[PDB]
Amino acid sequence: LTEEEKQQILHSEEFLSFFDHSTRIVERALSEQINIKLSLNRQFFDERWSKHRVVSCLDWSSQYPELLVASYNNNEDAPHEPDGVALVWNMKYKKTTPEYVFHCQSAVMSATFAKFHPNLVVGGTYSGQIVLWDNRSNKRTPVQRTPLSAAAHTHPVYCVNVVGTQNAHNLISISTDGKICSWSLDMLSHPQDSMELVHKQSKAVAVTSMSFPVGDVNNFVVGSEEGSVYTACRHGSKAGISEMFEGHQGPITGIHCHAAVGAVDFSHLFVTSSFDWTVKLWTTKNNKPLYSFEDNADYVYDVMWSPTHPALFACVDGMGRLDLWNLNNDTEVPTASISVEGNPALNRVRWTHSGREIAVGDSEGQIVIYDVGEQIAVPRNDEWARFGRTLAEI
Amino acid sequence: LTEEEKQQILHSEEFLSFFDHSTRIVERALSEQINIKLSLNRQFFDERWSKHRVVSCLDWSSQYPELLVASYNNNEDAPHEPDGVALVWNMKYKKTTPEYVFHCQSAVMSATFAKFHPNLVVGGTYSGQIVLWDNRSNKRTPVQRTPLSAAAHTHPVYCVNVVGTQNAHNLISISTDGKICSWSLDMLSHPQDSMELVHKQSKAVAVTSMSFPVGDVNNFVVGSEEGSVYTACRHGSKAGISEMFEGHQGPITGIHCHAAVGAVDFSHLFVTSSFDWTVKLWTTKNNKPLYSFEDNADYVYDVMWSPTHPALFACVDGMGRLDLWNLNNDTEVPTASISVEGNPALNRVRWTHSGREIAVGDSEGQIVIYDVGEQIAVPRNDEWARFGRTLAEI
Amino acid sequence: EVEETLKRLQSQKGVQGIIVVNTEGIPIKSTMDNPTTTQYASLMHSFILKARSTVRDIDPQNDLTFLRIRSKKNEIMVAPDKDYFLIVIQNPT
Amino acid sequence: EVEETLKRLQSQKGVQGIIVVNTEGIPIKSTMDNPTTTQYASLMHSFILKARSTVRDIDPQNDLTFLRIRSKKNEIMVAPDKDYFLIVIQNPT
Amino acid sequence: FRIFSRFNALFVRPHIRGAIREYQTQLIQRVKDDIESLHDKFKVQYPQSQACKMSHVRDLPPVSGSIIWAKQIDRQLTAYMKRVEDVLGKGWENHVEGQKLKQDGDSFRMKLNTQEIFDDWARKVQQRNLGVSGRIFTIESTRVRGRTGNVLKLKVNFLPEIITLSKEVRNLKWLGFRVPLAIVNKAHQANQLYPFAISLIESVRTYERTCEKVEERNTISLLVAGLKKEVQALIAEGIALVWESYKLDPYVQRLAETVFNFQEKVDDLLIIEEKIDLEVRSLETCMYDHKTFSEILNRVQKAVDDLNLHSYSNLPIWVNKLDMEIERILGVRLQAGLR
Amino acid sequence: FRIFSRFNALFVRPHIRGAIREYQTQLIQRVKDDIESLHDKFKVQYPQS
């Protein structure tokens, strides 16, 4: 009868594949195969990793349209416990448990998957340090960390993305001071490219978030908490600010470019959800806002285009209402709407790839995903044509 | 015990519990989840048997789509060396040597597999004897050899092909003089049917190519050495040539019917590869060359349709280029075109029965297995209608 | 209806009709290669009998109708009612 | 980690009892009591060894990576790869 | 209002205007209800509203957040007023309901002033007199609980909150509020000097963590002594520097790279150290056999050579001590075998 | 051939006719000596082509 060999083999941690496969199979074992318009589809609220916790970012895995990464800042509930909480939540089978967890010593502001590799996860934290995590390996510590240096990002980082294809990729990141930096997925210890973005008279732009024209690298569009949108070419013939926008009055929190591609070219349309209920539409060729969004006041967080419908997008109000806007059928009234129970401060919204359902963050950590009506999920050539003519309206 | 009481016990009507159990287990087991261009593809070039000795014909086994039959014809380097050599080359595994080797006393001009016997290779030679090769036998010589009597072929045979159902076969072959003969695959001492192809009374035909429309065995198309293609009937009161085609002013060096099924029929179409660089997309129901693709200074040598694309077809050339013509895409420039190194005179093209990748013969014996891109290989459901429109164009 | 069950089981992916093995280990129904299916079904019968012995060791009121033997190539579901042991090969996908 | 693993593997269904087994049978860990865990897991170890031989019969390269037995009274789990031998006592439903 | 916005073509013709003035009272009443709801929402204070903690998440300082929140609400009030003016026509205030509504809105807007908090914050900033000039970093005396001694823990002469102030300026400057030029200069200097301070503080924190980890395992400090000496030498060079200088960037950069190299060499040495210790412990109880003992010695010597080729500090004395320990263990095992 | 075959019936117009082949006569020179390159194949190949 062993008394120590089992004890020491338990102490020795060779359980990487063990734990990985056990997790991937037991949530499957939740299956009960015993032989004896908007609509909620799945509500997930991790009690252990989301108790009184604000969702910090949301991304859907392009390589794996079933994997979502969500972030968290420091927890005021307890400072001693790990502050930067990163969660990976899966679409494989119903379960309360999160599929993966991750810790960052600093508060995590944003996170996303990498397009270059289908398993690495990259996230920007409050300390301005890009943090790398490997999903296949079962670890809690950051795999890599960019240096906290003068050249590198130092102010809190809110936007990180991967541009290019799987052989011409490049990791772009912003610092709220205004530094743009390009790294590579292979090494996260030296900025391949880096410069402090400036608009004029050497004054920087307090960038909050950016997006990029769909299917295009370089020539990004950024938003400023100062209340101005800027189009800046990454390298071009001259890096830095290329165009300044009349923009919106208050701080510009969420910015996104049109993503649905069809018989017409609509990649020049920006949505910007400022802090004044004002989810503004416009185009890079026109310095003025194209259409002003007004149904209430006081902080709509953000907006993202549905990748499947060219004239439909999702924006959420911090009061607790997520509402789906079609542009073809209606210009002003919400074509779809819902309010998450508890009327909580819903933070971040992310359209899943290929659309057909939405992911919603919250200040309470209770993230909710749910689909959309078929009659409004699917586009048609009529939709693109009538969208073009609604653009011709004004 | 034995296989008679099981029948009665199944006929017994206590099977309600069994049927309920089966229904329950099947309905519970219904749910299933997971646990967690032109490119040079391969070479084939012997050295013992493939010194000069240009390629003559190629094929793929219907039962064994991983197998290619070649036939290197010309013996001019060494009179003492074997005259005709047919090599069979495997696709599943890469070997510098041919899988199996066969040599005939005369010079082989054409070879093909046997549909009924998946363990047999039949080939035609220059002298005029139809030649077998039983792969079971260890002896490289021909196993069964057709007599060179006036009953059988007496002129250099150029087309051999076995057709019919698995229970009713016929090995058709045609010689340059034009005597078509069907043999039984298992008995070749006597031609079980024969008939000399002749046009309008007292006009012999110099047959040098043929193809059977898919499915049909009773009627077929032949390309004569005199540049005038014909359609003939194998069995019937009108057995023989039944059509004049004005065709082309040079020898016909290749022919192939359409090789796709599933949508609107195109068996009436075929392409002939003339001797002046003029491939001819062109049909049986009409008499006038539908279109006359022309370019280049030299002349084509062989042409086949794609076995799954209802539009694509390859094209041999004299300076060594292989090009693919996608009519639905384009009718004027080859959709794809790449040149083999050393610019020798290519002599045979054969597409895999899958159609996903092409082969090509050579002037120096180096058979080259090329691969094609997915977008350029596999058609779509709308591809057939697009071909219909392109043909209805003129 | 036996043929109804045959077409129903055929509908399941990776499955060729319905094959049923009795208590003798010889399949009452013929769908796959006979020698392989008979020897393999005798092995299944031995293992289900020994598993029945163990389950009756501690659970003398339990019955076996479900067993998930999956490898990285194929899965077998084996289902004994009282004499008929349904066996269905099914890909993990 | 150990305690977190058993905690998450148990609270996922409020499982009656699970212990971690990284050795070939004869586990000294317990969740409810020593005997009903140790002897039952040893018998499961013998049977998964026999099932490993059973699945190697059809082809030696195949291995059993996962075993379920959902019977009328018990729903018993194991996920063997090289020495990780799960045990789960749970309701059939 | 949206229904009317669908139709504005013969509002110049006073024919539809009869219809709009027919329901003018309903319009005024419902607009008053809406603005009452808005002012009720405002009455819930910024720190009491989730918007405040959110804006905390936003890298937005609380004062700027409250100011801008109030400004946005005032903007929405002004939008209400101007849009009422446009929809109803010129001079709706002539009506008793119209002048009542305009007086109400003026009252709420007066209650919704914003410059006073700006003035208060500027006054407080001037009074507290935030500054960063001084020493590069400070060394202080703390009696850390758990030890009776007075620990001289090292810190950095830089309050992390100063950058916060800069951000307020960085937000208030474009908000239209003008701040004292002394505050502007202080905030600008702090903003441009922040990267050096944050790099220095993270470097010193990492050094302290790795050095306490080293001293936790005393068997390795002798090997790490050289790296600790060079780190202390750079610290000694730096501490003499006043807070602001021109060698700040090169010194800070070389200090950061030195600390990172020190930490990585520390961790590599530590892991190889537990490897060697585990192998020695295995040798302790290893079965009596020349082959197994020779293999253990071979692996230990290979690890020692791996350490040697990395060019660490103070190898020979460490080798001598481990040789003494291994020979003591060998003597004990020889005793057991001989008996 | 095909690039002016895109015109074919276009240059029947009074001005297109003046817009075509008055400007490209030297590319007709180019296709002439492309015929030169063509006959090069004929020049010395007869029994060893």
UniProtKB/Swiss-Prot annotation, chains A, B:
Q: Looking at the keywords, is Transport present? A: yes
The residue intervals holding the WD repeats read 50-99, 103-143, 152-193, 202-242, 247-292, 295-335, 341-380
- Location in or out of the cell: Cytoplasm, Cytoskeleton; Cytoplasm
Q: Name one GO cellular component term.
A: centrosome
Does the keyword section mention DNA repair? no
Q: Name one GO molecular function term.
A: microtubule motor activity
The main location class comes to cytoplasm
For this protein, what post-translational modification is recorded in UniProt? Pyrophosphorylation by 5-diphosphoinositol pentakisphosphate (5-IP7) promotes interaction with DCTN1. Serine pyrophosphorylation is achieved by Mg(2+)-dependent, but enzyme independent transfer of a beta-phosphate from a inositol pyrophosphate to a pre-phosphorylated serine residue.
Look up the domain of life of the source.
Answer: Eukaryota
The UniProt keyword set, sorted, is:
Acetylation, Cytoplasm, Cytoskeleton, Disease variant, Dynein, Host-virus interaction, Intellectual disability, Microtubule, Motor protein, Phosphoprotein, Repeat, Transport, WD repeat
Q: Which GO terms describe its biological process?
A: microtubule-based movement; transport along microtubule
Q: Kindly list any coiled-coil regions of this protein.
A: none
**Quaternary state and partners of this protein?**
Homodimer. The cytoplasmic dynein 1 complex consists of two catalytic heavy chains (HCs) and a number of non-catalytic subunits presented by intermediate chains (ICs), light intermediate chains (LICs) and light chains (LCs); the composition seems to vary in respect to the IC, LIC and LC composition. The heavy chain homodimer serves as a scaffold for the probable homodimeric assembly of the respective non-catalytic subunits. The ICs and LICs bind directly to the HC dimer and the LCs assemble on the IC dimer. Interacts with DYNLT3. Interacts with DYNLT1.
| Illness association | Neurodevelopmental disorder with microcephaly and structural brain anomalies: An autosomal recessive neurodevelopmental disorder characterized by global developmental delay, severe intellectual disability, microcephaly, dysmorphic facial features, and cerebral malformations including simplification of cerebral gyration, agenesis of the corpus callosum, and brainstem and white matter hypoplasia.
Q: What organism does the record attribute this protein to?
A: Homo sapiens
Curated annotation (Swiss-Prot), chains C, D:
One record GO biological process: visual behavior
Tell me where it mainly resides.
cytoplasm
Q: Name one Pfam family in it.
A: Robl_LC7
Q: Which GO terms describe its cellular component?
A: centrosome; ciliary tip; cilium; cytoplasm; cytoplasmic dynein complex; dynein complex; membrane; microtubule
Return one GO MF term.
Answer: microtubule motor activity
What subcellular compartments does it reside in? Cytoplasm, Cytoskeleton
Q: Which InterPro entries match?
A: DYNLRB1/2, Roadblock/LAMTOR2_dom
Q: Which domain of life is it from?
A: Eukaryota
Question: Where, by tissue, is this protein expressed?
Answer: High expression in heart, liver, brain and pancreas; moderate in placenta, skeletal muscle and kidney; low in lung, prostate, testis, small intestine and colon. Isoform 1 expression is up-regulated in 64% hepatocellular carcinoma (HCC) patients.
Task: Extract the signal peptide range.
Answer: none
SUPFAM superfamilies documented for this protein: Roadblock/LC7 domain
- Which keywords, in A-to-Z order, does the entry hold? Acetylation, Cytoplasm, Cytoskeleton, Dynein, Microtubule, Motor protein, Transport
Q: Does the keyword Iron apply?
A: no
Which PANTHER family does this UniProt record tie to the protein?
Answer: DYNEIN LIGHT CHAIN ROADBLOCK (PTHR10779)
Function per UniProt: Acts as one of several non-catalytic accessory components of the cytoplasmic dynein 1 complex that are thought to be involved in linking dynein to cargos and to adapter proteins that regulate dynein function. Cytoplasmic dynein 1 acts as a motor for the intracellular retrograde motility of vesicles and organelles along microtubules.
Q: Which family does it belong to?
A: Belongs to the GAMAD family.
Q: How does it assemble?
A: Homodimer. The cytoplasmic dynein 1 complex consists of two catalytic heavy chains (HCs) and a number of non-catalytic subunits presented by intermediate chains (ICs), light intermediate chains (LICs) and light chains (LCs); the composition seems to vary in respect to the IC, LIC and LC composition. The heavy chain homodimer serves as a scaffold for the probable homodimeric assembly of the respective non-catalytic subunits. The ICs and LICs bind directly to the HC dimer and the LCs assemble on the IC dimer. Interacts with DYNLRB2. Interacts with DYNC1I1 and DYNC1I2.
Protein's name according to its UniProt entry:
Dynein light chain roadblock-type 1
Its taxonomic path starts at: Eukaryota, Metazoa, Chordata, Craniata, Vertebrata
Curated annotation (Swiss-Prot), chain E:
Question: What is its subcellular localisation?
Answer: Cytoplasm, Cytoskeleton
Please give the superkingdom of this protein's source.
Eukaryota
Ranges for the region named Interaction with DYNC1LI2 are: 70-221
Q: What is the effect of changing residue 3 to L?
A: In SMALED1; disrupts dynein complex stability and function
How this chain assembles, per its entry, is: Homodimer. The cytoplasmic dynein 1 complex consists of two catalytic heavy chains (HCs) and a number of non-catalytic subunits presented by intermediate chains (ICs), light intermediate chains (LICs) and light chains (LCs); the composition seems to vary in respect to the IC, LIC and LC composition. The heavy chain homodimer serves as a scaffold for the probable homodimeric assembly of the respective non-catalytic subunits. The ICs and LICs bind directly to the HC dimer and dynein LCs assemble on the IC dimer. Interacts with DYNC1LI1; DYNC1LI1 and DYNC1LI2 bind mutually exclusive to DYNC1H1.
Family statement: Belongs to the dynein heavy chain family.
Function as written in the Swiss-Prot or TrEMBL entry: Cytoplasmic dynein 1 acts as a motor for the intracellular retrograde motility of vesicles and organelles along microtubules. Dynein has ATPase activity; the force-producing power stroke is thought to occur on release of ADP. Plays a role in mitotic spindle assembly and metaphase plate congression.
Annotated disease: Charcot-Marie-Tooth disease, axonal, type 2O: An axonal form of Charcot-Marie-Tooth disease, a disorder of the peripheral nervous system, characterized by progressive weakness and atrophy, initially of the peroneal muscles and later of the distal muscles of the arms. Charcot-Marie-Tooth disease is classified in two main groups on the basis of electrophysiologic properties and histopathology: primary peripheral demyelinating neuropathies (designated CMT1 when they are dominantly inherited) and primary peripheral axonal neuropathies (CMT2).
Protein name, UniProt field: Cytoplasmic dynein 1 heavy chain 1
Q: Which organism is it from?
A: Homo sapiens
Give the stretch of the parent protein shown, with its full length: 582 to 920 of 4646
